[PDB]
């Protein structure tokens, strides 16, 4: 019964990237462990995860991410593709989604089914600014908002009970992404989507 969480931020254009990187990394900070080194007997040792602070150029904000420079590009590139799509879409509103799934083996010939257990969606609202003062004020207020966002992500990280059980050695790529050198995230995929802004009903009001 995959759990879903929705966030929303209102930023200037040149603030999208960092904003996105602050959310993703934060989530990926909680959804990753040290790299497993298995022994033939079945036991395994767990590596050590490093963390570092990222100061934002365009936001008055700092966030903690894992010290894996390949993960940082797996994020920066897809965030760059989303940032490309937003500008190409014109004056309309976009969103990115981060899903954590596990692989489940199915009998031949069926492909193994990816079952998601957790999905994080953040909706991006882009505002165009006109003066330099608006830019400065935006730099501070977006920082405060992102503080609230990280706080809520952390509280959700307690309100979520389920996690996949630890795999055995041959079972490990059904649960974890083992392609990185310095961190072992849960199996995840990041996609994005440019929304059509819809209306609000004049019923409850």
């Amino acid at each position: 019964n995959c759990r879903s969480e929705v966030l929303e931020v209102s930023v200037e254009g040149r603030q999208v990237e960092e904003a996105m990187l602050a959310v993703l990394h934060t989530v990926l900070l909680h959804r990753s462990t040290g790299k497993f080194h298995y022994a033939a007997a079945g036991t395994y040792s767990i590596g050590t995860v490093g963390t570092q602070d990222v100061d934002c150029d365009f936001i008055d904000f700092t966030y903690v991410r894992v010290s894996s420079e390949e993960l940082d590009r797996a994020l920066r590139k897809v965030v760059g593709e989303f940032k490309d799509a937003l500008r190409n879409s014109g004056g309309d509103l976009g969103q990115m989604s981060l899903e954590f799934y596990q692989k489940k083996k199915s009998r031949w010939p069926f492909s193994d089914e990816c079952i998601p257990w957790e999905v994080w969606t953040v909706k991006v609202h882009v505002v165009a600014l006109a003066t330099e003062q608006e830019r400065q004020i935006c730099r501070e207020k977006v920082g405060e908002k992102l503080c609230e966002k990280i706080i809520n992500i952390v509280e959700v990280m307690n309100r979520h009970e389920y996690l996949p059980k630890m795999p055995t050695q041959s079972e490990v790529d059904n649960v974890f992404d083992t392609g990185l050198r310095d961190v072992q995230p849960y199996l995840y995929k990041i996609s994005f989507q440019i929304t059509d802004a819809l209306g609000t009903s004049v019923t409850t009001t």
């Binding site: 040290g34 590596g47 995860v49 903690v64 952390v154």
Partner: protein
């Protein structure tokens, strides 16, 4: 005792030590950067690279005096600021132990404590005292003690951000922060 609780009290002790480490280091005015490692040392607690500051460790053990958080006895880390005139309690981080016993629970606790430390790494950077401390005029202050959690020194209208909770056969640990 049973060895499982020897390991559990060891886990709680080093979780408290690393908690103080993370908070104090998050108030030192500079950015923290530690490296990952596939061949770790025997001193990488909770699979995290958190370097111990020996002075912070000495004040943390001297405050601890050889005991652990329990029902009624909680570890607190007070971050304050003293102007050139001269004492605002900015935030008090609270490490509690609760009555409820998780009887349906050896290393699940270890991993949950690791995740809680990661949440602490995240939360310590989004409270106002962080960007207050990164621009230091002003000098940041820390003080570790057992509570008897004394809230009043902050002010009226405070709010509590809950870092997280972890369940153990001996009780549930609660890490939170009351900040100005």
């Amino acid at each position: 005792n049973s060895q499982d609780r020897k390991d559990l009290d060891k886990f709680i002790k080093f979780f408290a030590l690393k908690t103080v480490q993370v908070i104090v280091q998050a108030r030192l005015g500079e950015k923290i950067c530690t490296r990952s490692s596939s061949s770790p040392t025997g001193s990488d607690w909770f699979n995290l690279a958190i370097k111990d500051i020996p002075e912070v460790t000495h004040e943390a053990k001297k405050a601890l005096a050889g005991q652990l958080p329990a029902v009624g006895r909680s570890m607190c880390v007070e971050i304050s600021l003293k102007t050139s005139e001269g004492s605002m309690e900015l935030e008090i981080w609270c490490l509690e132990m609760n009555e409820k016993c998780d009887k349906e629970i050896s290393y699940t606790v270890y991993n949950r404590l690791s995740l809680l430390l990661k949440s602490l790494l995240a939360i310590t950077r989004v409270t106002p005292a962080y960007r207050l401390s990164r621009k230091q005029e002003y000098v940041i202050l820390y003080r570790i003690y057992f509570g008897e959690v004394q809230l009043s020194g902050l002010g009226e209208g405070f709010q509590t951000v809950r870092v997280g909770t972890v369940g153990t056969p001996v009780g549930t640990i609660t890490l939170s922060c009351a900040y100005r």
